[PDB]
mmCIF file of C-alpha atoms and ligand atoms in Angstrom:
data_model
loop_
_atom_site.group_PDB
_atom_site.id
_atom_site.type_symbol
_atom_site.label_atom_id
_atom_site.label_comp_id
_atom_site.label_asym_id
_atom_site.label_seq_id
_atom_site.Cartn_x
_atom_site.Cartn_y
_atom_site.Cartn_z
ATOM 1 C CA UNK A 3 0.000 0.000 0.000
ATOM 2 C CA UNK A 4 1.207 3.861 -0.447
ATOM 3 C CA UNK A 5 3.326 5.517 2.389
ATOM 4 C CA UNK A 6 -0.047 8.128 2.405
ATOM 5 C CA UNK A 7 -1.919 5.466 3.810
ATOM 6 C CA UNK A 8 0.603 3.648 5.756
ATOM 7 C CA UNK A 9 1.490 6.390 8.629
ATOM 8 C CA UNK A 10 -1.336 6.441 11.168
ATOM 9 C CA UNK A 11 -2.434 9.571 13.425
ATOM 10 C CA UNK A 12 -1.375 9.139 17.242
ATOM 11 C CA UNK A 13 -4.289 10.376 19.663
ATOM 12 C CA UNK A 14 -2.636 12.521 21.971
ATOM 13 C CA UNK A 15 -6.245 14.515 23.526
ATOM 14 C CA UNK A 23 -13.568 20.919 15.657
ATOM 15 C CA UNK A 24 -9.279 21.594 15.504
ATOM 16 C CA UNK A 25 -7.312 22.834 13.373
ATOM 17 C CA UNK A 26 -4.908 20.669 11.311
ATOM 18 C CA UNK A 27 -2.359 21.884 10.225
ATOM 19 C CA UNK A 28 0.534 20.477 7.322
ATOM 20 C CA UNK A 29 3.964 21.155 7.164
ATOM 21 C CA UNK A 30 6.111 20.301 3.893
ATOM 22 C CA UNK A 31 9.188 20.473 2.403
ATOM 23 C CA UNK A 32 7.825 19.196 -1.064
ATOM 24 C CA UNK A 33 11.272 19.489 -3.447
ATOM 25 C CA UNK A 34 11.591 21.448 -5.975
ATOM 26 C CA UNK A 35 11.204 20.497 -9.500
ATOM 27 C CA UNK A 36 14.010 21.638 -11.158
ATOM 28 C CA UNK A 37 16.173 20.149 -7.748
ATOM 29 C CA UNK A 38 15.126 17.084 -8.223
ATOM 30 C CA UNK A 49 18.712 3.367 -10.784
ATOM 31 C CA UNK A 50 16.259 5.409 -12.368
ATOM 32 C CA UNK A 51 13.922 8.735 -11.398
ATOM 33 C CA UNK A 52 10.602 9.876 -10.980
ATOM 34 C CA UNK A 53 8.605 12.177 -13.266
ATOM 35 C CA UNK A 54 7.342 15.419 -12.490
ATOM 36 C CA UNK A 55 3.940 14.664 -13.993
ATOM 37 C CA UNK A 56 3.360 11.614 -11.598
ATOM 38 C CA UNK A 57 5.552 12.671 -8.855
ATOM 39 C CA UNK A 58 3.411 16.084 -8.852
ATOM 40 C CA UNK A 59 0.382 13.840 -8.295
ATOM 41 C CA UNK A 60 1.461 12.152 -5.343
ATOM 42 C CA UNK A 61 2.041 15.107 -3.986
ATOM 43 C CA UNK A 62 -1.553 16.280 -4.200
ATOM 44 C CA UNK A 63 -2.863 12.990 -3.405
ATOM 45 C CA UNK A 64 -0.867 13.276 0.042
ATOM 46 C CA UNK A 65 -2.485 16.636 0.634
ATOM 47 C CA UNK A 66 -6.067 15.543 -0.225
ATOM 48 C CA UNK A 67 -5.593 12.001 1.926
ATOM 49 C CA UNK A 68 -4.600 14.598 5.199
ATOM 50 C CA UNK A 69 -7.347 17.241 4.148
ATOM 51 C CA UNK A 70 -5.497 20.333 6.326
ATOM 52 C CA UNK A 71 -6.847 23.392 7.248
ATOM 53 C CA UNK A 72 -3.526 25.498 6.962
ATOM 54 C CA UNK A 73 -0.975 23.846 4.242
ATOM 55 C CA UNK A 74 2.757 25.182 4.769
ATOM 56 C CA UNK A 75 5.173 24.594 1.770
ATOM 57 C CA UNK A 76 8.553 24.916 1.340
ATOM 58 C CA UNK A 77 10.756 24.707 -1.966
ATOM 59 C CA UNK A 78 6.992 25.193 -4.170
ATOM 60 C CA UNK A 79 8.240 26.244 -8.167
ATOM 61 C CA UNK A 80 5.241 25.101 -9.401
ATOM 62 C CA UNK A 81 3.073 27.128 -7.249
ATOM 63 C CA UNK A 82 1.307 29.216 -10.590
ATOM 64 C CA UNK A 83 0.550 26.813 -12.767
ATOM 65 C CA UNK A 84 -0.304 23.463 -10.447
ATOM 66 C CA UNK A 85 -1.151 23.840 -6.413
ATOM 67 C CA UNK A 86 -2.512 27.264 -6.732
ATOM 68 C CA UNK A 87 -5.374 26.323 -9.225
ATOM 69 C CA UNK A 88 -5.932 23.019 -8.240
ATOM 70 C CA UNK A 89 -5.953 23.380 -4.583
ATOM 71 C CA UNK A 90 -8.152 27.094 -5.143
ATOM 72 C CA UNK A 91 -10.761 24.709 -6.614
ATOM 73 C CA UNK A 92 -10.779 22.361 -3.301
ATOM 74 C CA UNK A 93 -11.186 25.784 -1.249
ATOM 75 C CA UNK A 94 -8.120 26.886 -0.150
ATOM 76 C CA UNK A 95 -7.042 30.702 -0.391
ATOM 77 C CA UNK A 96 -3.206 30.671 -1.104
ATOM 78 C CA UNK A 97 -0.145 33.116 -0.972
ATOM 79 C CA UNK A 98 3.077 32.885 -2.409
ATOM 80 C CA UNK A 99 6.287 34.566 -1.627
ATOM 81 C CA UNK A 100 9.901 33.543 -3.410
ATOM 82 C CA UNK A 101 12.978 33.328 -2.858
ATOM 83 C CA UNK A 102 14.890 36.541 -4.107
ATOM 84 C CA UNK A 103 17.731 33.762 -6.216
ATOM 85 C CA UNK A 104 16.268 30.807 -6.143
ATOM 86 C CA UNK A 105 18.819 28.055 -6.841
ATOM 87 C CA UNK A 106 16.310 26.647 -9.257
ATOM 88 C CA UNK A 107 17.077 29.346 -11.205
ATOM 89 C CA UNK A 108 20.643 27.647 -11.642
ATOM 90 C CA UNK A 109 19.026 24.553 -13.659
ATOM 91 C CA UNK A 110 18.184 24.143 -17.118
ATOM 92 C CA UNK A 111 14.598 23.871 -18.310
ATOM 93 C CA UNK A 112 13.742 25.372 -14.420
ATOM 94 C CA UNK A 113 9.651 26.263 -13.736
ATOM 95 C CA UNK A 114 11.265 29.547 -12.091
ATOM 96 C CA UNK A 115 12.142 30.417 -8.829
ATOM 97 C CA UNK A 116 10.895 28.192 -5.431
ATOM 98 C CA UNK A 117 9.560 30.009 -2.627
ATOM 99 C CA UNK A 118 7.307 29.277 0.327
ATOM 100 C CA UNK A 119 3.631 28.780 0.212
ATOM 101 C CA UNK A 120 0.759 29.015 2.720
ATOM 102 C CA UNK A 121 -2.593 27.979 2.039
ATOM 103 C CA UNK A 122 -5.776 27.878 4.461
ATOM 104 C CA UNK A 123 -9.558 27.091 3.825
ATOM 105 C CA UNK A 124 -11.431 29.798 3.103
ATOM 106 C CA UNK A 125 -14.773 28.796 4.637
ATOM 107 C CA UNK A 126 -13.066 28.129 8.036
ATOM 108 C CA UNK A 127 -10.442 30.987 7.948
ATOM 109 C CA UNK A 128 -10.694 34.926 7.524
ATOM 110 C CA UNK A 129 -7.565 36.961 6.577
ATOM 111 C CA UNK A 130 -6.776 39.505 9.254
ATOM 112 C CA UNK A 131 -3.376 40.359 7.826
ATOM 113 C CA UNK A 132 0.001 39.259 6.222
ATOM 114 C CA UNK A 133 3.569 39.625 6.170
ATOM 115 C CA UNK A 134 6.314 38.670 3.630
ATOM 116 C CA UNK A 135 9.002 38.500 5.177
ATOM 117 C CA UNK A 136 12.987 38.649 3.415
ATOM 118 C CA UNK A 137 14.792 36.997 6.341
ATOM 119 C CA UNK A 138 18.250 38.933 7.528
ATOM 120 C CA UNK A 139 21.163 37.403 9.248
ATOM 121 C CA UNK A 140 23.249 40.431 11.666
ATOM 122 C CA UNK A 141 21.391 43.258 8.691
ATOM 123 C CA UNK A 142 22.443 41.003 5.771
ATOM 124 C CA UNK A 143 19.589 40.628 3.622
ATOM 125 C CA UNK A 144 19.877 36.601 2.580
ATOM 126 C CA UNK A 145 18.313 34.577 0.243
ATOM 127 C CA UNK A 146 15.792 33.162 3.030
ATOM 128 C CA UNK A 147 12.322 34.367 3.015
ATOM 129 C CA UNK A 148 9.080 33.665 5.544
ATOM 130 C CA UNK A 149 5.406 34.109 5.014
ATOM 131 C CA UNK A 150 3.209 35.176 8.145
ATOM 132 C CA UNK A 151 -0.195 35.618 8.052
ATOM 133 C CA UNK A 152 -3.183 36.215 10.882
ATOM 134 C CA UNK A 153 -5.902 34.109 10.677
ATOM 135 C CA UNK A 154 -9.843 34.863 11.894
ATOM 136 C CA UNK A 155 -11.846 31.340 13.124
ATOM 137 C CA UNK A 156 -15.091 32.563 11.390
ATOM 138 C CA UNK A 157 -17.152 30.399 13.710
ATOM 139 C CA UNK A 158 -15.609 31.382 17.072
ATOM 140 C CA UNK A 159 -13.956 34.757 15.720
ATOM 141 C CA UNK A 160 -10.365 33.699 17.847
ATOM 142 C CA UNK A 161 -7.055 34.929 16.051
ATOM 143 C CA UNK A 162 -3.667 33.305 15.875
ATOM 144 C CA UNK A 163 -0.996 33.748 13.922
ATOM 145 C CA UNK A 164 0.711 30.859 11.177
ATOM 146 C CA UNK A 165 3.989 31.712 9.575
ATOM 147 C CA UNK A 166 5.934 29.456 7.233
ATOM 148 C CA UNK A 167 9.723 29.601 6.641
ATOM 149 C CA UNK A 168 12.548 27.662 4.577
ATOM 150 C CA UNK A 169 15.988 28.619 6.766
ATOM 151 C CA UNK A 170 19.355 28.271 5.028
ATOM 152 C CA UNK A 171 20.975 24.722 4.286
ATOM 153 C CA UNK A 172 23.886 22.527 5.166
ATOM 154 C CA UNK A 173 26.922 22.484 7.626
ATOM 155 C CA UNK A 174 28.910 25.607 7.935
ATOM 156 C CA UNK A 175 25.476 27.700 8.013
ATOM 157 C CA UNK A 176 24.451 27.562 11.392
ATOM 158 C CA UNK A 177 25.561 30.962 12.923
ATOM 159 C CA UNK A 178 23.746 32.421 9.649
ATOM 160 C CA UNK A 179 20.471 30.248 10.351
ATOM 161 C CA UNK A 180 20.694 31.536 14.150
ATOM 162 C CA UNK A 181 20.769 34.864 13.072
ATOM 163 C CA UNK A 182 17.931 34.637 10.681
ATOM 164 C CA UNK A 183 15.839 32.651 13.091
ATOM 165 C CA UNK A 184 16.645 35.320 14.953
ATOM 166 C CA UNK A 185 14.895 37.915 13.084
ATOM 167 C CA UNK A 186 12.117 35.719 12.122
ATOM 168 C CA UNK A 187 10.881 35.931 15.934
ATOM 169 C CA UNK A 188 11.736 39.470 16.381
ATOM 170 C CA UNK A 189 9.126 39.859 13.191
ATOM 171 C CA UNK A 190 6.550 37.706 14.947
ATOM 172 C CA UNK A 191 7.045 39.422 17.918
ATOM 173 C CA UNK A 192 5.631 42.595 16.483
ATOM 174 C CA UNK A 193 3.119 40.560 14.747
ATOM 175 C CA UNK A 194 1.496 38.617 17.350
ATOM 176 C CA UNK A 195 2.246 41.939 19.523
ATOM 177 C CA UNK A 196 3.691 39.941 22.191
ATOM 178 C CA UNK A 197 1.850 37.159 23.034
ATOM 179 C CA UNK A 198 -1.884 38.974 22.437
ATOM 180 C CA UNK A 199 -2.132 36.893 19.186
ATOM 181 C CA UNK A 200 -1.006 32.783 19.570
ATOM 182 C CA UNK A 201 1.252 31.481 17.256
ATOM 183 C CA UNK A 202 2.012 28.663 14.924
ATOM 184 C CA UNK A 203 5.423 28.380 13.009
ATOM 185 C CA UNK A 204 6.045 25.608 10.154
ATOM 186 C CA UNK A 205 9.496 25.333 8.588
ATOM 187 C CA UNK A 206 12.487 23.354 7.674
ATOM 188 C CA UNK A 207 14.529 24.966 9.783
ATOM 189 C CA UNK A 208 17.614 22.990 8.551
ATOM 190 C CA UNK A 209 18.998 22.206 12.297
ATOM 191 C CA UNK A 210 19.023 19.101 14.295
ATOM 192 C CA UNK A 211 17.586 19.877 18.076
ATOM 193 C CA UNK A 212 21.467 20.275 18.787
ATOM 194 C CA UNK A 213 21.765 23.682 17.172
ATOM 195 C CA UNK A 214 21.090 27.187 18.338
ATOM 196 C CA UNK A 215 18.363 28.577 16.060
ATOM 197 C CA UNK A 216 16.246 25.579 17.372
ATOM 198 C CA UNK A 217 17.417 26.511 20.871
ATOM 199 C CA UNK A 218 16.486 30.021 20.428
ATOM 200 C CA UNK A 219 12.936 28.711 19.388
ATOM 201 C CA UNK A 220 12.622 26.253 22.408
ATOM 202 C CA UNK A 221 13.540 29.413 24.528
ATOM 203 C CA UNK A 222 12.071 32.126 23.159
ATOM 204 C CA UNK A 223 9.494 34.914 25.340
ATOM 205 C CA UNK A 224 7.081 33.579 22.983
ATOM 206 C CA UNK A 225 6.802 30.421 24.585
ATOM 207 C CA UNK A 226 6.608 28.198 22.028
ATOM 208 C CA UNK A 227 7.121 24.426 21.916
ATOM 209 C CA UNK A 228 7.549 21.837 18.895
ATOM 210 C CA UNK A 229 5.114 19.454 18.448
ATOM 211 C CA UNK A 230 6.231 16.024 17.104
ATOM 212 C CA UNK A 231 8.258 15.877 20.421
ATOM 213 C CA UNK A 232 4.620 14.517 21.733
ATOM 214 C CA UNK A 233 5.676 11.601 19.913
ATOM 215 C CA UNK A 234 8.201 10.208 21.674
ATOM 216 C CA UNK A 235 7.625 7.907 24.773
ATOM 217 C CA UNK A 236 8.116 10.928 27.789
ATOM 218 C CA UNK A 237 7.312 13.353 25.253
ATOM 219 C CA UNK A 238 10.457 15.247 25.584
ATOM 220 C CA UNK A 239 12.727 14.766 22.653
ATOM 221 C CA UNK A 240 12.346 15.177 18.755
ATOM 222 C CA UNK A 241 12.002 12.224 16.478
ATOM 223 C CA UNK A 242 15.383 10.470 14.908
ATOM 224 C CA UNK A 243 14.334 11.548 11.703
ATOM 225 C CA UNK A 244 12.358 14.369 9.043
ATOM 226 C CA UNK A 245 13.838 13.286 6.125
ATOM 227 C CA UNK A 246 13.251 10.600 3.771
ATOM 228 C CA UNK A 255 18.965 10.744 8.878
ATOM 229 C CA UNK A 256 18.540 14.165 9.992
ATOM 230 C CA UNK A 257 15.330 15.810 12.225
ATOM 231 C CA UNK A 258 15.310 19.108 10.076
ATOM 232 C CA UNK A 259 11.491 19.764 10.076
ATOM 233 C CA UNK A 260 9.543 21.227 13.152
ATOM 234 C CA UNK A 261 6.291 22.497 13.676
ATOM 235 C CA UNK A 262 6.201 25.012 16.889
ATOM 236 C CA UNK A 263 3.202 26.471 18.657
ATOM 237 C CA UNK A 264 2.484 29.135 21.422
ATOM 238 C CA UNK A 265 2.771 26.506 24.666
ATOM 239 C CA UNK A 266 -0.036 28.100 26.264
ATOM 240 C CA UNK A 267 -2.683 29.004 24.106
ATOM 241 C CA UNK A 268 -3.207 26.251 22.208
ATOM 242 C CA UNK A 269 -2.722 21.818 22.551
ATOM 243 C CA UNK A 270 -2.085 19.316 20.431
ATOM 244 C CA UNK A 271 -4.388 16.953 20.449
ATOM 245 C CA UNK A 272 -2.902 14.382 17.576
ATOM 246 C CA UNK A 273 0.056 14.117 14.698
ATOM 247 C CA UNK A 274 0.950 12.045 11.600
ATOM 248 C CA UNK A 275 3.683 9.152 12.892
ATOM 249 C CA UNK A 276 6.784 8.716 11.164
ATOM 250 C CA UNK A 277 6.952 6.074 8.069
ATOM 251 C CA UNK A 278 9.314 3.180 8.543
ATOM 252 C CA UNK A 288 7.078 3.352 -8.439
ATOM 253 C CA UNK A 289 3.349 4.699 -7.220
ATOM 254 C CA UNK A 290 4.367 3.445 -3.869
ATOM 255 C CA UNK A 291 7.133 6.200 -3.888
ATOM 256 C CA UNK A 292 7.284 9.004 -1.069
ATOM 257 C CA UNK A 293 7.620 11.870 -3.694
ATOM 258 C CA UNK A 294 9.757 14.391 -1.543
ATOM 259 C CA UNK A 295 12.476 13.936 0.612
ATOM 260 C CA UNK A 296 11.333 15.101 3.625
ATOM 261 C CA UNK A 297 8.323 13.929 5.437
ATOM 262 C CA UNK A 298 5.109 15.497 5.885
ATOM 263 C CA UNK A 299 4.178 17.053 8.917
ATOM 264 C CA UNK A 300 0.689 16.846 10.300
ATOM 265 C CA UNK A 301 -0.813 18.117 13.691
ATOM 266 C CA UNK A 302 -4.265 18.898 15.115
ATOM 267 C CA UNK A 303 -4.414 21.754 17.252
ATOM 268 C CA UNK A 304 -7.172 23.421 19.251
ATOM 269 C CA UNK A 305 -7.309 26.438 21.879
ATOM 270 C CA UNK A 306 -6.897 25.686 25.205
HETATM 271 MG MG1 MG B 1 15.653 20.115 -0.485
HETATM 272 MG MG1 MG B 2 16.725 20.972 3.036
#
């Protein structure tokens, strides 16, 4: 059976579910699989976990495939690139990659949004973040989801400190303190060992990662993101909101078509 249906949701209690993925680019990605079928997968994962907020990462095919085809299952979506997008570096590219959120439109109201061109000690890098504040059109409560795709590899991590850096300072004035709750999504590119993701973990905005609710005293991060490093996270405001479940780890159609994992947890306000 496909990898979709083979990772089960772990009960950990109408919420709000919320996706996280690193989807790889197009133009960055024995034999190989096609963009026309791996592209499908790829939808066919989103529609299996029907999310009310989708966070992408690495999307160059945001104008011609996930924006119309996921506007016509409801969802309102924005897209924000990446100034030089390395897909720009590859011959026969779909243009640059860039970050994507999407939400449901019947459940969600737009309050505001942010696009935010990440900088590392004033350097203005190639790293960018979406943030945008969300009504509940039922109970009219705001919070805050932001979506970010930090810089890559060894030898970066002072750079992807200082960026994470000024991604909370941003969401700081955002969520005005802590008046707004707050939901971050990103491949942050750092193992639980480095500082950006110790900034997070100790930030003023109180935020805590959620797949750590996975493990068996709930206090460490799972062994793996990828498809064997933990580079994904999904954070959330500690004490405004719980998480009540999330998508377990997985152990030619039956191909997982990125290579990190999707990210999948249901949230409500506590
Ligand atoms: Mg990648
Ligand atoms: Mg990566």
């Amino acid at each position: 059976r496909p990898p979709r249906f083979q990772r089960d949701f772990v009960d950990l209690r109408p919420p709000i579910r919320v996706m996280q993925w690193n989807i790889l680019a197009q133009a960055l990605g024995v034999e190989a699989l096609k963009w026309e079928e791996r592209k499908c997968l790829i939808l066919e994962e989103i529609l299996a976990y029907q999310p009310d907020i989708l966070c992408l990462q690495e999307v160059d095919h945001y104008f011609d495939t996930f924006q119309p085809l996921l506007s016509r299952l409801g969802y309102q979506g924005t897209f924000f690139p990446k100034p030089w997008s390395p897909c720009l570096d590859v011959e026969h590219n779909n243009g640059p990659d860039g970050c994507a959120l999407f939400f449901l439109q019947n459940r969600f109201k737009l309050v505001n949004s942010a696009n935010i061109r990440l900088t590392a000690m004033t350097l203005k890098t190639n790293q960018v973040a979406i943030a945008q504040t969300l009504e509940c059109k039922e109970s009219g409560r705001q919070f805050c989801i932001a979506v970010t795709h930090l810089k890559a590899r060894t030898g970066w991590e002072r750079f992807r400190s200082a960026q994470g850096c000024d991604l909370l300072q941003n969401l700081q004035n955002i969520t005005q303190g802590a008046k707004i709750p707050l939901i971050v999504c990103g491949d942050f590119n750092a193992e639980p060992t480095e500082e950006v993701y110790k900034h997070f973990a100790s930030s003023s905005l109180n935020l805590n990662s959620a797949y750590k609710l996975l493990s068996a005293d709930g206090q460490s991060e799972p062994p793996y993101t990828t498809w064997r490093h933990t580079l994904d996270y999904i954070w959330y405001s500690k004490h405004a909101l719980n998480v009540r479940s999330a998508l377990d780890l997985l152990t030619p159609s039956f191909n997982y078509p990125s290579d990190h994992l999707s990210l999948v947890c249901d949230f409500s306000f506590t």
